[PDB]
Design a protein around this ligand. Structure first.
Ligand code: ATP
Ligand code: ATP
Lengths: 353, 353
């Protein structure tokens, strides 16, 4: 019966020669939670997963599973199970069971198979699996060992959108049930928001932020994070903090007394507002800000209508629900939800919000 | 100066041995329009593009460019330019100019470069192109020839989301300007809805439907099309046409006097309603239909909240704008926009709407 093991990553560093793949990573994965390591290629997420698995040792640092320092133990002694990417399903799931009693194997395979709802496909073969999913079999074999830490690396990279989504839900629910500490690696910001109880955004080997999808989405602490989750991406416009307003390359926004930019008056900061936190008059937000402009391009995707409006010299994207194929050239009155606005220091790109 | 050439595909068939890649395709691409051939892998879209280019001959059929039968002419005599996937930009774009006068080349390169807004990168090299996009150079070289028919095959397959979108707009506007007949191939339904003036949905070598993004989206003539454009996919539930209502595996929907199913009373048809055409009480549609159910899973993507609600034995997806992380288990009252409902015959999967 699966346990809820807390995992600690202390001052973890990994560098191949001169290149630092992971720089002083300090992270505490809460026992039984589903943590996701989101980030672009080369950010260090995969190298961090491998070190946790034991397939790769740290250049410096320590790794804990519960109170045990597992930093220097073989991947086999860490009670873990990796999940990436001629026999029968039963055999496929029993495989990982490695000096194991048959009487025990049958109980585990029945257990796993039932959790992945594939008990009925047990006596079938791979290419024959037309009554289920070879995917679900892969997971069952993953949990059949009853690991303390479940590790996954872009497990749904090659799946048709529709199916993939189904697996996101399949996996998340299973984990919510087993309550097994899971660390999930992926570059897909949508998939991260769907599965992680908390998400750890990475870049250039560093941990930029960690928290619930709600926190990293509504309150990102920097430009990178603010733009890596949520698409269309958040609009970032360069501006100058005047009195109680902001001036852009051809526009201004009245800043209600907010104005936590008192230390940036006369200086330049980064304005931020998501396409979904804007709209157009003639289509309720407590406080708002207006700016008129002409539509430069429209993305009538049927289920959404993304507009490319020209704010002075700048160009931003506005997201409207449904199919609203307005035509380019026409002028619209953009309405900004002042409560969803963000402001980042231009140098440290750190939020000031 | 580019011309507006109408392209006709008459009873086009292409079969490698016993396999039919394209079955009796009849299509009329309107001069100067941007037509998109959307469809999954193996549908025949690419083989149709190649036959148009002349790189591949038909097994039967005829192809017209204007009043000229170009079916059996070398790709070079068809005045076309393909676009798929050490020199200087100027050189790169001049390359296609193949017995050409320099005095003429300079005018064309200047022309193209200006249209792709890359005149300032002309004396630069590929890997050095840090001030623009090697992508824009590719297109400029494509139009530099001044083709009658512009052909493109998944040109943006390997581009980071953000960039890709920029190219969709870049390309579409350029074409809207040049008014050159363009046939665009892609499996991306979103990209299709963004660029095609009309879209031709294909599958198993057949043309299922053609029309504006608005038409194929709001009024698809079959299950396939109705589910291939718009994601999350349209919900399809099997039902029986009673009096003025529909009965599902655990639910019913009052059908206002609609009811064009008079010939399906007592029979079974396919109910259809998109996730974006539904909602939840407590969050205006002229006519509606209700059904209560419990949330099975939630996709809080920040910019959208996709719910997986259990309608009786069936499970459907509802799309709500914004971040509304409701919790699983809770029961919601789903509201269906009766005006966005579709009904397809269960056998021919052809719409009855
Ligand atoms: N053996 C190695 N030698 C040199 N550099 C390496 C080695 N392994 C990984 N790297 C570097 O690590 C980074 C990849 O990080 P990982 O943490 O591997 O990235 P992802 O997981 O972000 O990317 P990927 O999907 O390619 O693994 C790259 O910047 C790459 O150059
Ligand atoms: N030379 C060939 N010999 C046998 N089959 C072929 C050949 N060329 C294409 N096909 C078949 O054509 C179909 C691919 O259609 P195309 O019209 O090529 O598809 P897509 O454009 O839908 O897919 P792809 O991206 O692979 O080209 C497949 O069903 C494939 O088996």
């Amino acid at each position: 019966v699966i346990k809820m093991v807390e995992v600690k990553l202390e001052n973890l560093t990994k560098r191949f020669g001169n290149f630092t793949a992971v720089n002083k990573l300090n992270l505490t994965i809460k026992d039984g939670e589903f943590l996701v390591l989101l980030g672009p290629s080369g950010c260090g997420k995969t190298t961090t997963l491998r070190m946790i698995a034991g397939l790769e040792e740290p250049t410096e640092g320590r790794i804990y599973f519960g109170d045990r320092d597992v930093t220097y133990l073989p991947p086999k002694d860490r009670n873990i199970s990796m999940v990436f990417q001629h026999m029968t399903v039963y055999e496929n799931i029993a495989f990982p069971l490695k000096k194991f009693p048959k009487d025990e194997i049958d109980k585990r395979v029945r257990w796993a198979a039932e959790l992945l709802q594939i008990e009925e496909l047990l006596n079938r073969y791979p290419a024959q699996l037309s009554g289920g999913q070879r995917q679900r079999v892969a997971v069952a074999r993953a949990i059949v060992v009853e690991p303390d830490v479940l590790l996954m690396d872009e497990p749904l990279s090659n799946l048709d959108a529709k199916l993939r989504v189904a697996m996101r839900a399949e996996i998340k629910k299973l984990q919510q049930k087993l309550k097994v500490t899971t660390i999930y690696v992926t570059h897909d910001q949508v998939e991260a928001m769907t599965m992680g109880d908390r998400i750890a955004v990475m870049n250039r080997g560093q941990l930029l932020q960690i928290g619930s999808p709600t926190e990293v989405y509504l309150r990102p602490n920097s430009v990178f994070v603010a733009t890596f989750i949520g698409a269309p991406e958040m609009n970032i416009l360069e501006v100058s903090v005047g009195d109680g307003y902001l001036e852009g390359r051809g526009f201004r926004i009245e800043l209600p007394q907010m104005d936590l930019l008192k230390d940036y008056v006369g200086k330049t900061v980064l304005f931020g507002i998501r396409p979904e936190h804007m709209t157009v008059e003639g289509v309720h937000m407590k406080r708002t800000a207006r700016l008129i402009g002409k539509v430069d391009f429209v993305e009538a995707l049927g289920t959404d209508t993304i507009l490319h409006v020209k704010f002075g010299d700048e160009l931003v994207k506005v997201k409207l629900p449904g199919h609203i194929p307005i035509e380019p050239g026409r002028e619209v009155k953009v309405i900004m939800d002042l409560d969803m606005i963000h402001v980042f220091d231009k140098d440290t790109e750190k939020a000031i919000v």
